[PDB]
Enzyme design. Structure first.
Site, PDB file in Angstrom:
ATOM      1  N   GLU A 144     -24.461 -14.824  30.475  1.00 53.10           N
ATOM      2  CA  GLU A 144     -24.567 -15.992  30.975  1.00 53.10           C
ATOM      3  C   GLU A 144     -23.763 -17.116  30.144  1.00 53.10           C
ATOM      4  O   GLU A 144     -22.990 -16.724  29.137  1.00 53.10           O
ATOM      5  CB  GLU A 144     -25.986 -16.658  31.196  1.00 53.10           C
ATOM      6  CG  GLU A 144     -26.519 -16.097  32.641  1.00 53.10           C
ATOM      7  CD  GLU A 144     -25.618 -16.255  33.677  1.00 53.10           C
ATOM      8  OE1 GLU A 144     -25.290 -17.561  33.936  1.00 53.10           O
ATOM      9  OE2 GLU A 144     -25.630 -15.419  34.483  1.00 53.10           O
ATOM     10  N   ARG A 145     -24.035 -18.438  30.354  1.00 53.67           N
ATOM     11  CA  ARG A 145     -23.249 -19.654  29.816  1.00 53.67           C
ATOM     12  C   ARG A 145     -23.585 -20.049  28.416  1.00 53.67           C
ATOM     13  O   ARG A 145     -24.458 -20.087  28.320  1.00 53.67           O
ATOM     14  CB  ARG A 145     -23.162 -20.644  30.745  1.00 53.67           C
ATOM     15  CG  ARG A 145     -22.634 -20.518  32.230  1.00 53.67           C
ATOM     16  CD  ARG A 145     -22.597 -21.874  32.926  1.00 53.67           C
ATOM     17  NE  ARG A 145     -22.168 -21.632  34.320  1.00 53.67           N
ATOM     18  CZ  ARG A 145     -23.044 -21.188  35.518  1.00 53.67           C
ATOM     19  NH1 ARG A 145     -24.087 -21.094  35.347  1.00 53.67           N
ATOM     20  NH2 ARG A 145     -22.226 -21.362  36.514  1.00 53.67           N
ATOM     21  N   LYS A 166     -31.587 -20.420  40.168  1.00 50.23           N
ATOM     22  CA  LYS A 166     -32.248 -19.377  39.368  1.00 50.23           C
ATOM     23  C   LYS A 166     -32.374 -19.821  38.078  1.00 50.23           C
ATOM     24  O   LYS A 166     -33.707 -19.571  37.606  1.00 50.23           O
ATOM     25  CB  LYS A 166     -31.180 -18.078  39.261  1.00 50.23           C
ATOM     26  CG  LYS A 166     -30.958 -17.585  40.583  1.00 50.23           C
ATOM     27  CD  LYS A 166     -29.895 -16.311  40.402  1.00 50.23           C
ATOM     28  CE  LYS A 166     -28.664 -16.556  39.588  1.00 50.23           C
ATOM     29  NZ  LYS A 166     -28.155 -17.703  40.516  1.00 50.23           N
TER      30      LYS A 166
END
Ligand code: ATP
Ligand code: ADP
Ligand code: MG
Ligand code: MG
Lengths: 85, 458, 55, 460
Positions: B180-181, B154
């Protein structure tokens, strides 16, 4: 840092969570189960020298600190597609 | 004025004098040790009790702390002062740079544009990517969703779309990191500063370390900046790093808010919470928003409520398959599930439309044969059925492509492929012009000419 | 030549039935891992409903 | 005087507080003015002090907390006997056909106990339906219970219309039709069908359509039984047709959560088997008179595992299973021979001639279902020539069980057929032996007798 069987941590948050009557999600884990692991793991990082200098109060200069992590997970029947994996 | 009376995880109950009770979505403020904590009001209970979500860590809160009532919602900086900067959910600066030179602040809770305001557009937007604009092309001002499981691609796909679209496009852009990261936030910021494109991009980050209130409302902080640039009359690109985290942070708080569980344990409000977020991401007669959203699919289950609700919201949908990615075909787009509102003869025209439906028909028929092949082997097929397989396998390889952002993995250099070259290549394969080449000739080649040069050396 | 080709037909069929038997044995085990997931998931859902309905 | 007050309204369920010395009995009726309209409530539970929980026999819309409720010291009582014939009534036994007042002489409570063990009878006189697969595979008897099982769209209604045409016109006796949870369109078309064919004067219809509040559908079946029990106790022989038994159980599910019960099984009420048994055990033939009944049974998603269809199977005597897997091929009547069965299919009733013919047909279709699995992957050449022959004669028998109904001409466009039992047996023997080995499969499909399957082969 090695964490052995984060699958067994997850299984013991489900016990605490279910004993506290919290509504279970997929399988029987709480919705909080992603926050359980992500808050844990996101702490393993490399930090720039400016952070080390600020944390140490300038006693250490120009060195980048680090923490690598190797979490272990156990899959039933090799199924990579389960919720905790 | 208020008193804390319960603390349950992320949720804090506050009592107020009954003449003074805060409105819904008001911001409150409380001193937590050596820092200031904001609380957002969710519900009015009886008796002047009000129930609120902490925009930060709730540990170290006592009962009986004094709480201060701010008379307004959470309000964030907007406009050009936000460009080139990294911001908190609360709109605080998160880069080490000085204060944000705001001229105006906007409340993050807003109504969607009226039905009269909306605008249609059919301007096809080109991408570098063979499968995407062949199978699921999309327009300027439309919405795209990238659906996939864990680790399927993604983010790499969205990073090619940023590279291809957001640098040949000339206007401003917003990137919202949602659950997210943190590493990938830092990596993205440095490549923007190294490329000196940062000064066109606003970044809101509420990554997965953050407590649930941050992850839930950072999406709305991101839209509120994009809505300022749209209402100014610009054309804007909005990138949302994982929309699924917005819904999941709702699930985490919903039981503590006292709401009975629904379905697979989701909040009962799931479709409204998603819908009120999604309807604001629309192009309008005043100005346009083009949007790309990544959509995590839990346990690869595309029939889970959260993916299922998201599918009605979007104009083009690209579905990424673990089964394809484990072949090492990348991008791992499933062409039998990916689809777009724009794949219509009137807008694309007939040659594109016929090529896409031909590819879809051959690849469907190959799925119908695979259960025969799996038991009996291929020799039992008819000589036309063998030709469908021999073509379908070439088509699956030619859908693969080297990405410029993927060079750190593949090593081989990235390719940009024109829409004229993609339809010409697949139309040539289905006409059978290339049935003398091996399958490996098609794997990871930019254009059909590159396949014939690869075939010479096998 | 007719007789020797007939002997070769029976040999080629013997081998083709070995593959069909192993392929069928390979599919059954994947259908069983898929079934045990569904078997377990449906038990887990309906108890979440029964307990939730005992409000 | 009115002596209680409404204290909650949640959905269809209304709670009323009476004085602590005059609390209504369970299943008593109660009455309230919902504005202009009079509304009836049925008492389900006594709980706390003086409070009773009740189901509305009509819409809750417009009820208020505080309305005065009259206590009628009897259960719901419905008109019974000859006055009912040719009339349409609702669950409360009120005329809904505009024809005027029912003009009864007697009224009976819809709640009553079943016949005692000493009163039952075993008079299994065989009954001919004229439908090949039913008369061979699942023979009826007078006074028995018949179930037509199937999921949506498989033919339960047109099968019941065919059975109504063949036996119910011939029967020479009264009939009751219970439209439980039925579509209002089809209830109209049945009423005109019975009127235009001029048999409506024999038959009384009780209708509880879907739009009706959950209370009505919950009780409308008991109103139909109570009329049939009046004619049985007279000593008449009556036919009882039930539009869909499942919808009574489903109306129980709707109210059960509001009545405070914990859920069970696939979210069914815990009382499911008790509620089914208490209805079904009244539909029996005593020493004074016989009730023959045909019930349609909805099978959710065609899963015969589901608790509601799985529970009813035990109460019937013949069970006909209609399968979508057959219906997908268009081969109506879509009766599955390998699942349909009857208590009457044994040599001591049917005789050995019929018994041997039915067991033969079952053995052939069973064998072919295993052979069909080989064919689809390996092909038919891998069979023994005897297994090829069984695959042929089975695939013919499968088509020969089809029959066009002269209640289905609007769908088919073709003339409907009736068969005697005698001719049915002779036809299946003829396919099981060699006499028709040479006809194609399509020469059987929707034919009629075997004696005209040869003619379609000549046409084919
Ligand atoms: N086009 C590509 N070429 C080479 N490798 C790729 C490509 N797309 C994805 N991959 C590989 O897939 C892996 C994960 O992809 P990516 O990081 O984009 O997934 P993701 O969106 O972060 O998934 P998640 O968000 O669930 O972690 C990376 O190792 C990447 O190399
Ligand atoms: N014996 C039949 N002959 C022709 N068509 C039939 C037959 N049985 C069922 N069908 C078709 O199936 C439709 C639905 O069957 P019906 O009995 O009306 O529904 P249900 O089975 O749900 O009561 C009919 O309208 C007709 O189209
Ligand atoms: Mg990602
Ligand atoms: Mg019907």
């Amino acid at each position: 840092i090695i964490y052995d069987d984060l699958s067994k941590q997850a299984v013991a948050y489900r016990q605490i969570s279910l004993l506290l009557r919290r509504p279970p999600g997929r399988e029987a884990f709480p919705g909080d189960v992603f926050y359980l692991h992500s808050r844990l793991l996101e702490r393993a990082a490399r930090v720039n020298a400016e952070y080390v200098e600020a944390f140490t109060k300038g006693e250490v200069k120009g060195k980048t600190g680090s923490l690598t992590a190797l979490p272990i997970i156990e899959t039933q029947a090799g199924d990579v597609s389960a919720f905790v994996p | 004025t208020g008193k804390i009376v319960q603390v349950i995880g992320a949720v804090v109950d506050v009592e107020f004098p009954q003449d003074a009770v805060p409105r819904v979505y008001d911001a409150l403020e409380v001193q937590n040790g050596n820092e200031r904590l904001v609380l957002e009001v969710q519900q009015q209970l009886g008796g002047g009790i009000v129930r609120t979500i902490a925009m930060g860590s709730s540990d170290g809160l006592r009962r009986g702390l004094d709480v201060k009532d701010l008379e307004h919602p959470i309000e964030v900086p907007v406009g050009k002062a936000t460009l080139g900067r990294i911001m908190n959910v609360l709109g605080e600066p998160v880069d080490m740079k000085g204060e944000i030179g705001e001229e105006e602040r906007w409340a993050i809770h807003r109504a969607a544009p009226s039905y009269e305001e909306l605008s249609n557009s059919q301007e096809l937007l080109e991408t570098g990517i063979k499968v995407i604009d062949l199978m699921a092309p999309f327009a300027k001002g439309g919405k795209v969703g990238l659906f996939g499981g864990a680790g399927v691609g993604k983010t790499v796909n969205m990073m090619e779309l940023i590279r291809n679209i957001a640098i040949e496009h000339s206007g401003y852009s917003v990137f919202a990191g949602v659950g997210e990261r943190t590493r990938e936030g830092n990596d993205f910021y440095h490549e923007m500063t190294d490329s000196n494109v940062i000064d066109k991009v606003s970044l809101v980050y509420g990554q997965m370390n953050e407590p649930p209130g941050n992850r839930l409302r950072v999406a709305l902080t991101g839209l509120t900046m994009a809505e300022k640039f749209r209402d100014e009359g610009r054309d804007v690109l909005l990138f949302v790093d994982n929309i699924y985290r917005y819904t999941l942070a709702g699930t985490e708080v919903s039981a503590l808010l006292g709401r009975m569980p629904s379905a697979v344990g989701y909040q009962p409000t799931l479709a409204e919470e998603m819908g009120v977020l999604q309807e604001r991401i629309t192009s309008t007669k005043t100005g346009s928003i083009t949007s790309v959203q990544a959509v995590y699919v839990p346990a690869d289950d595309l029939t889970d409520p959260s993916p299922a609700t998201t599918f009605a919201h979007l104009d083009a949908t690209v579905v990424l398959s673990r089964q394809i990615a484990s072949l090492g075909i990348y991008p791992a787009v499933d062409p039998l599930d990916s689809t777009s509102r724009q794949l219509d003869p009137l807008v694309v025209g007939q040659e594109h439309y016929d090529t896409a439906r031909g590819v879809q028909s051959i690849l469907q028929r190959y799925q119908e044969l695979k259960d025969i092949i799996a038991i009996l082997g291929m020799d039992e097929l008819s000589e036309e059925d063998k030709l469908v397989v021999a073509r379908a396998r070439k088509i699956q390889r030619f859908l693969s492509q080297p990405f410029f952002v993927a060079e750190v993995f593949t090593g081989s250099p990235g390719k940009y492929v024109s829409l004229k070259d993609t339809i010409r290549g697949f139309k040539g394969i289905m006409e059978g012009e290339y049935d003398h080449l091996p399958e490996q000739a098609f794997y990871m080649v930019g254009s059909i000419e590159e396949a014939v040069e690869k075939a010479k050396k096998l | 030549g007719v007789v020797e080709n007939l002997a070769s037909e029976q040999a080629a069929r013997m081998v083709a039935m070995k593959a069909a038997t192993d392929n069928g044995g390979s599919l059954i085990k994947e259908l069983q891992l898929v079934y045990n997931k569904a078997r377990q998931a449906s038990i887990t859902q309906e108890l979440t409903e029964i307990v939730s309905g005992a409000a």
